[PDB]
Subunit: 187 residues, 2 copies
């Protein structure tokens, strides 16, 4: 069957960090569900792009399991993910069942907030490093994409293609990632 | 006063080629209007991301002028742009007032369709090259972003950041473009 991705879309999400992985994963044949943290209502992103989610998180939760749960960044987006009990429940479940969790830019700070993946090697945006490392619950990495077991992290809007392709590779293999990447006209 | 950008959003637009330039231009302090070709309703893009436009094109066309008009790609998106008389009028008026026109991926084939900027060095997505240069109305460039006068073109989702930063440099200067670039964590120069 198709692999499945859940992308949790909160108010203030960075729209490039949301759209690049959704689009790239769908190019790979992954069934992606863009789930509104606050319900099915359109979501205002960090630079005011308004994206209409496929479903509420509430509804998407009862439609899994997902091969990957993806947390976009955005200062406000990440704060909102970090404050949600529903997100906590979803990530705890994914981690417990040995499913992939992928977070980009400020997104990984929601992993910290929800006590997810402690002991893992992670990266973040350089501006998020200090918040992420508060408590020494992770080992920090400067890699543009970092994968430590089932915790996959990345640094910024400009690493979003790399992040998304790393997810495709994890789920579908190198050859699929290659087929997807070719037409993207990446450097 | 701030510069203004009109981004014309059609059903089937490539959502990365739409969102990257909107976001990057807004980072630069450009006032960007995402204008829906069909009206004010949300627009389904090529990989099913649904974007709510700020305004209809019919409306935004009345809030001119714009410092840049931006045509995203996407096969179906570019086809809808190519088939619109409203888009033709906008592009004709922009070229006539010596304003920038910026088109990415299959988006430049809309310039061909509307007879815009013939004689320009342009680039497109590799799979759009043949259609763009049928009739010999342009010179082709393999550069990831090309700028020939007021015709600025680029190749694909993977060149969207460079495309958007070129628009920023053309409108707001190299200093602002470098300011906007710094926090993106794009690749270094080496």
């Amino acid at each position: 069957a198709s692999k499945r991705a859940l992308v949790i879309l909160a108010k203030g999400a960075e729209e490039m960090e949301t759209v690049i992985p959704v689009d790239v994963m769908r190019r790979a044949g992954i069934k992606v569900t863009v789930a509104g943290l606050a319900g099915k209502d359109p979501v205002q992103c960090s630079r005011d792009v308004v994206i209409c989610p496929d479903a509420s998180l509430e509804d998407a939760k009862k439609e899994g399991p997902y091969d990957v749960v993806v947390l976009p960044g955005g200062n406000l987006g990440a704060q909102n993910l970090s404050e949600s009990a529903a997100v906590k429940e979803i990530l705890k479940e994914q981690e417990n069942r040995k499913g992939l969790i992928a977070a980009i830019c400020a997104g990984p700070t929601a992993l910290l907030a929800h006590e997810i993946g402690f002991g893992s090697k992670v990266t973040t945006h350089p501006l998020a490093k200090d918040k992420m490392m508060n408590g020494g619950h992770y080992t920090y990495s400067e890699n543009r994409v970092e994968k430590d077991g089932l915790i996959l992290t990345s640094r910024g809007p400009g690493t979003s293609f790399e992040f998304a392709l790393a997810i495709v590779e994890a789920l579908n293999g190198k050859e699929v990632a290659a087929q997807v990447k070719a037409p993207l006209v990446l450097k």
